[PDB]
Structure formats: structure tokens, C-alpha cells
Amino acid sequence: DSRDYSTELSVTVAVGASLLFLNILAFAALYYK
């Protein structure tokens, strides 16, 4: 097996970035009076 972890790391970081993006959007909804 090709013992390299880039696509796995890439997709995990993509999912994490999506989650944090949605949560900062939640702050954008709140803090905007």
C-alpha cells in the first residue's frame, strides 16, 4: 500500500474548514445588529 496521507488529510481539512466556515457564518448572523 502507498503509505502516503495527503488526500485523506486534504479532505479532512476541507470538511473542517467547511464546519468552521458555517460557524463563523453563525457569528455573522448574530453580531450583525
Place this chain on the structure above:
Amino acid sequence: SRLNQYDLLGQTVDSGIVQSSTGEYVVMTTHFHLKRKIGYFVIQTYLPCIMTVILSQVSFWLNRESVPARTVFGVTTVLTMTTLSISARNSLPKVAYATAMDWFIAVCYAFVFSALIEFATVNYFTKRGYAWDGKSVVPEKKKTFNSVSKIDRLSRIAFPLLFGIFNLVYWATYL
């Protein structure tokens, strides 16, 4: 016959050929047919479980105001069924699949649990904390008294009927 558990019905004698990587071999075969004795498990396991279920269902015939009494029935019958289940399973070969007696005990345990839940539902709708005093007249719809719970009246028919039909189908299936 040195058998305590079983009864030897008979024997069947035959012959055949068995294949192997080394070759074909003649095999003389006998088959002794055995039937387990049921009376011990009836007197020891099935009957006390049935009587415990009957005791659990007996709680429906008491007045709804006897909250500690009916709670004591429910939980102590649960404990008794637990003890009976553990004892019945202890004297049995340690098989990881469920046998017929396991299913019977499970259904009885569910029936006892359901009787306790039925009492809980009945007590949730009890209004007055005092039972009928005997002397005072109850005007059918202290001055006022709680009516007999229609949940109790329905359970008095439903629970024994359900247990009876379960017993009928169980014993018809396995016997």
C-alpha cells in the same frame, strides 16, 4: 438405562461409506434416540414464572390509592422474576443462543414490567390521595372519591388474555 435427564425411545442401526483424502472407509453407525424429561423444568421453572406473572396481574384488582402497595407488587415481582430467570439459566449448558425457556422467561419478564408500567400510568391519573371510606356513598357519575380506573378495568381483561394466548401458542409450538 442409566439416564436421569432423558428417556431412551429406541435405536436405529445402519451402515455406510465415508469418503476421505486417504480413501473410502466402511462405517457402521447406530443412532440412539433420546427425549428430554419435561416435568422437572415445569415444576421448577415454568410454574413459578407463571405464578409470578399471575401475582403481577393481581395488582390490577386493588384500589388505585394504594400507591406503596402496588409499587411493592410491581418492583418485588420484577425482582422475583429476575431471581427465577438467573436460577433457571444457571442450570443449563452455557449456550450463547436463546432457547425456548429463555423466550418464555423473557416474555414473562416483559409481562411483569408491563404490569408495573400500567400501574404507573394509572397512578398518574389518580386525583385524590384518600381511598374510599366504606360508609360514605359514592355518587356514580369525604364528599368525592376517585372512580375505578378504566385502565385497570381494561388491563384486568387484556393482561390475562394476552398471557393465556401466549401460553397457548408457545405450548402448541414446542410440544
Place this chain on the structure above:
Amino acid sequence: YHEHYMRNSRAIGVLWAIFTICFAIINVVVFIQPYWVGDSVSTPKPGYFGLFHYCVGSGLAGRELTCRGSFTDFSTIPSSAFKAAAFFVLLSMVLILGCITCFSLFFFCNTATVYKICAWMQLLAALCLVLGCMIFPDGWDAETIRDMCGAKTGKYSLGDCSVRWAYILAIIGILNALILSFLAFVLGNRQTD
């Protein structure tokens, strides 16, 4: 204007609940799955290890991954730092599941106080997750970890072994937990208005 305010409050609260559930799933996954660290091309032996569970190869040009380590057993864990990290991550799991339970309190209790309760609970869960993530590399000096990765690996030093998806997922969980806690605080205050 008030109805827009209330509808946005409701929608943002629902979204905060979904993201809380997502973070709880992340916490369970990172606690269970043993892919915090992984072998490399230059590693003496193959395999991987997480907080408590570790699998290592026999070393005969195959997998034959012998596996050992369960959190229920406090001895198979390679080092005390690993034990502390596993305990902290478990406590974070318990805290976040406790907030998901406290979602039930929304029926009766005032919305602000329950929002603050999950806010503090998620902040504490994030603090526990940070403590676990900081304490976990301390245990890389363990003789089993050294035997896997090599002699160069040590305290706070990856060496040949490389971090796999679970570690970065835990860091993402840390960030997510902090921001969810702040979101809960501001939501609880914005209900009061």
C-alpha cells in the same frame, strides 16, 4: 423587526444544535479511531496508534498488525501522558454529550440559562480537548512508541512518524468547540435582548 429577530434566533439556535451534534460526533470519532499518528516510508516498523490503542506490524513484508490497548485497561496504555490525554478526551466527550442532553431542558427552563449552561459546558469540553491534545505528544518518549517510530522520536518530537487524520480532526474539534461555546454565550444573551 421583532419577528425577523425571533425567527433568526430560532434558526441560528437550531443550526447551533446541529453543529453541536457534529462536534460530538467528531469527539467520539477521534477518541475511538486510532489514527492520531501513522508510520512513514522511513519508519522502522509500520502501523499506527491513538490515545490508548496501538497497532504495529511484525516486520516481514506484510501487515500482520498485532494490536493492543483499550482504555478500559489502564496498563496497556504505553505511558502516563497517553492515559491523561485519553482521560481528558473522555471527559470532553462526557461534557459535550451532557450539553446535548441539556438540550432537553429547553422545554421548561428559560432559554438564556440553558444556552449559557451549554456555553460553559462546551467551553470546558474544549479546554479538556486542548489539554488532551497538548499532553498527548508528551508520551511519545515511551519505549513502544520509540520502538515503532525509531530512536529520534521523543517528547514533542514527531520524528519519522506522521500525524494522521485523527489528530488534525481533534485540533479542528478544539477550534469548533471554542467557537460553538462563544456562539452559545452570544445566543443566550441575545434571547434576553
Place this chain on the structure above:
Amino acid sequence: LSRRMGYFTIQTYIPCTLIVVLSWVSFWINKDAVPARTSLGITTVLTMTTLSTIARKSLPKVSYVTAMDLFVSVCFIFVFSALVEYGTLHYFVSNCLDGKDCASFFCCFEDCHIRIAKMDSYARIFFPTAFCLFNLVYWVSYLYLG
């Protein structure tokens, strides 16, 4: 080899779950029914103590918690918590730029305890929610993730 779960499902998992449910039944029993609720709680605790005996009958005396041990332990804590909940309820009933400050934007030091009379209302949904969440994490963990 893979073990079969039919006997364990029938014998200890389902009965332990049912005993936990019967412990929850105390929350719907009316307050001031002190003997009933106390008897229910303590006898459910006794029944869990009885049930926990058969958890390790098959196994050797290993010094780590198995999945069965964990399930039984958590159910025991659940019934213990129900009884302690009723005890607490009975005792307390018988007798700079973000928005404001670090006491009103956090710790609720404005009134808060006061509302203890509604502890049964909380426990009616809190206890089933906690047990259902525990079962979801418990069963998903031991079957799919690992």
C-alpha cells in the same frame, strides 16, 4: 471465532434496560408518596445489584472493564442517580465590548436553587435522553467504529 449475543441480549441487556426504565417510573409517581418512591428506587438498585452478578459468570477474572461490565455499570449509575434525585427533591421540598461583563455575559449571577420543585419535570426527559445518548454512543462504538 465470533461470539453470539442472543443469550446476552435476552439475559442481561434487555433486563438491565427495563430496570432502568422502571427506575425512571419513579419520576412520574406523585411527590409526597415517599414510601412508594423510596421503595421503588432502592429495590431497583437491589435488582441491578442482583443482575450485575451474572455479567462475569462466563469470563475469567480479568482486571479490565468489558463492554458488558460497562453497560451494567452505567445502568447502575442511572438507577443510583434516580434514587439520589428523589432524595434531593424530597429534602428540598419538605424544608468589556462584547456585550456587558464577566458575570452577566457568563455565570448567571442575577438570580441563580430556587426552582427545585420542578426537578421531576427535568428528570422525566433528562434521564431518558441521557440513557438514549449513552446507548447511541455505546452501540455505535462497539459495532461500527471499533
Place this chain on the structure above:
Amino acid sequence: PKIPYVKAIDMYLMGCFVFVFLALLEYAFVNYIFFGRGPQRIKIPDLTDVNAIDRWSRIVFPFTFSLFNLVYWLYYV
């Protein structure tokens, strides 16, 4: 010893279990008679009076248990 068939001791234990079970049913019957049939308003006494049922049980349960003991011991000894 595990010897699965019915024995004298098994019969005695079953008999005693039946007696305690019957006593519990007797109380249940008394309770239903007082509280169930009430609001609608040795030779067995009338069912109406709960004290009559209790006195009948007081007389009869020891007598029936003694009869069971006599039959058991004479049949087995």
C-alpha cells in the same frame, strides 16, 4: 444435586410456594371485595364481610397446611 425429575423435596417446596401465593391472593380478594364491590353495595362465610373472609382464612390456612403436611409425611415416610 442436579437430578432433573420431581422429588419429595420439590413437591414440598412447591406446596409451600402455593400456600404463600394463595395468602397473597386472599389479601387481594379482600381488598377488591371491600373497595371494588363495596361502593356498589369449615363452611365458607359470606363474601360481603371482609372480616369474615379474614377469619375464615385464619381458621383454614393453618388447617389446610397441616393437612398437606400430614398427607406428605404419611405418603413419603
